[PDB]
């Protein structure tokens, strides 16, 4: 689709069999979801945002369907204010910015 | 133009007689600029994201040119690690997400 930006670019994703809402976020290197259970191994990681740094759990090679488009890649889980889909999965679904 | 997301979508902006690089950020409601001594009245504000909140100065009706596309609106100035172009200006330059 083409998504304009007068509203937050919020979409439904499916991850670990569950539906969630997430913000399409070109300003994020990575995909960071609020606290949730994901299957498999994780490793501790630290990431930075506008307010400083946080600790996250890193899950690799997680399938995520985003607005009907398939991605499989890294998902970080920790205390983010909103679920964000970052460039690591945006690129997989063929997302560009156009103006 | 069309901006792919392999890399951070950094573009040249002009604000307050300065040329800067800034991140096109569909995840940001607001535009937040690195500390800079803009003239004009301002009002204090707090904005948050990953890592919590930073204190910023809100300036209204600031002309900002983004890749040659003119815009004018609110810019927040404070200790952000990076200049961020949020949806308030991205909508003025006609910016969309496409996949």
């Amino acid at each position: 689709p083409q998504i304009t930006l007068w509203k937050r670019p919020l979409v439904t994703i499916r991850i670990g069999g569950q539906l969630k809402e997430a913000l399409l976020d070109t300003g994020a290197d990575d995909t960071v979801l609020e606290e949730m259970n994901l299957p498999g191994k994780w490793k501790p990681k630290m990431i930075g945002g506008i307010g400083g740094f946080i600790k996250v759990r890193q899950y690799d090679q997680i399938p995520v369907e985003i607005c009907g488009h398939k991605a499989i890649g890294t998902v970080l889980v920790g205390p983010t204010p909103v679920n964000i889909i970052g460039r690591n999965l945006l690129t997989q679904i063929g997302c560009t910015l156009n103006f | 133009p069309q901006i792919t997301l392999w890399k951070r979508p950094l573009v040249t902006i002009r604000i307050g007689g300065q040329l800067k690089e800034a991140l096109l950020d569909t995840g940001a409601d607001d535009t937040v600029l690195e500390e800079m001594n803009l003239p004009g009245k301002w009002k204090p504000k707090m904005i948050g994201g990953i890592g919590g909140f930073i204190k910023v100065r809100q300036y209204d009706q600031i002309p900002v040119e983004i890749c040659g596309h003119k815009a004018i609106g609110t810019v927040l100035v404070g200790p952000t690690p990076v200049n961020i172009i949020g949806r308030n200006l991205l909508t003025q330059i006609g910016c969309t997400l496409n996949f």
Binding site: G27, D29, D30, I47, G48, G49 | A28, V82
Partner: peptide, 4 residues
């Protein structure tokens, strides 16, 4: 790493 960096997420705005």
């Amino acid at each position: 790493s960096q997420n705005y």
